Design a protein around this nucleic acid. Sequence first.
DNA 1: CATAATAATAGTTTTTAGTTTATTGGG
DNA 2: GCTAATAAACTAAAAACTATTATTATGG
Lengths: 489, 163, 53, 281
Amino acid sequence: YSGRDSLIFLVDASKAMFESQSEDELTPFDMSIQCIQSVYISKIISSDRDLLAVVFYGTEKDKNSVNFKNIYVLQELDNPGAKRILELDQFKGQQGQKRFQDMMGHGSDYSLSEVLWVCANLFSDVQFKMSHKRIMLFTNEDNPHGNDSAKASRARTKAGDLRDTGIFLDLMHLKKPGGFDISLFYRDIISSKLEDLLRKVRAKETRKRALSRLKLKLNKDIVISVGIYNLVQKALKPPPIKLYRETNEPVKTKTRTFNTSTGGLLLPSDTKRSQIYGSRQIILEKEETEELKRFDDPGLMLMGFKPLVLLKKHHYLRPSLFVYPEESLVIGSSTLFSALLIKCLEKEVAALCRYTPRRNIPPYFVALVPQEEELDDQKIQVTPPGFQLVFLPFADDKRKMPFTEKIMATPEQVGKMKAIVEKLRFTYRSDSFENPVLQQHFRNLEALALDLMEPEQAVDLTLPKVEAMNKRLGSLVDEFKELVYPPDY
Amino acid sequence: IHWPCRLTIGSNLSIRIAAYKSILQERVKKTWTVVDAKTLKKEDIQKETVYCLNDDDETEVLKEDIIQGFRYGSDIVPFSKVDEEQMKYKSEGKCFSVLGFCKSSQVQRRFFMGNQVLKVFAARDDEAAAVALSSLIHALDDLDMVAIVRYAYDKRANPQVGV
Amino acid sequence: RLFQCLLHRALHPREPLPPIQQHIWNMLNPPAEVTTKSQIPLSKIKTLFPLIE
Amino acid sequence: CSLLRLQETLSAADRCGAALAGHQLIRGLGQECVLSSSPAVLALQTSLVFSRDFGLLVFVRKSLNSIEFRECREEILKFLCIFLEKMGQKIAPYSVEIKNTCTSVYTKDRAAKCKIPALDLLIKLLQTFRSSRLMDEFKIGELFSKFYGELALKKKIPDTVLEKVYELLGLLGEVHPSEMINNAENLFRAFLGELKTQMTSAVREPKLPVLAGCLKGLSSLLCNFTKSMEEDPQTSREIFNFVLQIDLKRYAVPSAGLRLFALHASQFSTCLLDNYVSLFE
DNA sequence: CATAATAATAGTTTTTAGTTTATTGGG
DNA sequence: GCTAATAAACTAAAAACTATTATTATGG
């Protein structure tokens, strides 16, 4: 499902950004600004399909297209970008706070119902596929129901409308964190993470819409609608958009075939593919090439059933893809596959096929790991019910080794090193790998997008150490390595 | 060919190892050389990349006055080749260092990544260390232990975490 | 298939190219005796479930 | 006046980047379009100079990829073409003007981000020549020189419904100098090759849209006098009817090929000896 | 020939697919 | 005494995300 996650950033202007309010820090203006800046950076690196707008409930002198009193409209709904980063840097730090004092000032009178009015206007402004719409708000004023009851009633009515409209609002601890003490009564219409928001984890791109769906033409009679998808991706280099080094102007690199001799623009027609082999240049053509690659229609033709016992580590290829059952023109796909999964204890003998990716391209043997409905107790469908597309190699997929068959050592070595490795058991964490080049690259991009003094080099969990395992375990591994002249040359 | 490295973890481990590819496609060597249909002479064929500009006449300019932009957020950040060449850093050398240990039961065949199978060889010039590594292989097998290794493909490539 | 196309265009480049092949294509097909043992249960499942919408 | 008010405010409401402003501009464009739809002779003359001035204004001043410009000038070209229906020759010293403007328009995004404006360009200019031949149709010589320069272009990246190879971009407005003859024989061999590609009508590669939508109409305006009934290509293009399989969807393209076969029925000598009944039935 | 007929034939940014890029190499 | 065998990167790339317009049916 495509859709722009619109997010609004409601930050106070009177004191909730400026009063300690049962705390001792500085004005929450600066911390809130840095928090939202961090999340903007996180989106820029991780999500540029989500619109953002910042609003200041409370305004001495209105900066608002709505022109309503106590409305300060800084940034309109739009995807994250550098102009907004500069916009917030104007109000970043205590220098930014005193700026805020300069053009409009703090202690600003508020208009809550009008704030809901104008943010509703902003939500109405969008013209695109919307995935989510959230109001993000911090306030030291956890319960300013001390206002006129008419304003509170109208604000609650507007909240009922907007959540009825589907608009979502978030107020999160700024005065009395934890214990539900925060929002002493503004809990009425709203029903921690500052560390994450400042942490601004980024560079996370994920599937948004369905793609690459096919059918299980298992025999010449039966087909079963399915869909092929990925969750393991190879991180790319971001596109080098050739810009004029002076004027930042893009490049129309006009690349074509041609003739080195007669100065004419050649075409694939008046040219032919060829293969210089032996004594014969083996000629071909573009459609000839396609046909030589054109084998059969895309889909899954069942070639057999193999137990999940022949599969071994050497039986491995490119990272596996996934198949989910689909019912667009094959009734019972999901039903029959549910039967397959319930009888998957016996269906360790998984399906065998020579999968054809698309037309004009050949099929290839790819095994299918039966994915169960592994729904977690917290209701996370890890490995959704389907099949993992582990790819069956050919004799092509081989680069042989020598055969200097090595023999086992004395069992005391095995036992002592088992004690070593289990004593030196690294805490398992699947979501623990970030590429230092990748991370440092993100940091260069974000830092050399502003005038940052330096891009930080992210010390990743992927970096091995020298003493952390040498204090969790110690040098007893080397002392155990009792053989003369250990591989520590 | 030999991928020489010393598998070094902590303050004590350093095992000389030469890595080799086990699963690897043999791709076609001689390619579909496109030749003129009427002369079959690729030598008489030109492949020019006319780096034109966004002009009516699209004035061509070499990369001399061209920078590599990057659509950073709702904007483009241009990085010159040296600009994007100093910002970089990767594990220099044929790096291969294990991060730690865990049971292979945690991971599944449906949780693999990487395109081939890379049989890393035993200790180099140390048969005692080689048989010790064989015993360590057995130790890993007994405990389902995994050698989660940070692996720079070489000096020229970035690090790649693996097992 | 590439090899047999090479043989075609070598011995007789002046000819239309053949299909991928039979025999090489032949040696990929799934077990025929399994299809034989299957067709009755295969009929059972396939008639048991319409596969169209 | 209304024409003047739009010429000014429209030239005023184009301030920096507000796509909302630019689409109120396309809105005023629609207003001027319906104005021209309700014309008067005095209004005809007045809208002529307003066309000149403010069309050049939108032509040069906007000149940018901003979506406001994109759509507004898309419908600008739309309106200019749908008005091309009737001016008379009065667009003769004004013909070359917009000829050059439109050629540059092609050199713009209509070479990079070709869209409906590109087809607007094409139709406007082509109907222009077929409404006016060889009173300023001599700049078109070098114009097509460049075009064939960018027509021998191998880059088929542009859009499919904006492809330019097999039905309408006819080019014979000039005197057919040896220029277009030498370029045209190359065009002809390209036609032969990619039509042979087209008739693999069993490989599920139709590629019919405007791919089979521009340059063999260039052939149509080109084959009228070229490559007489003297060789194998004659019978090849004769065969090129065969399929013109079932199409439905009004079957415009097969019927389009059949219509061209009608056009050059004269060009069908010396081989149609064969297959009397099959052709005729 | 009647004249607002309301389906397919794409429009889309898709990630993801083969790109020479690279150095140890037989003397 | 010599001279790859690669593999950082190639430089790309075919995917429906979306669908207006024509559809030629039926008022005109």
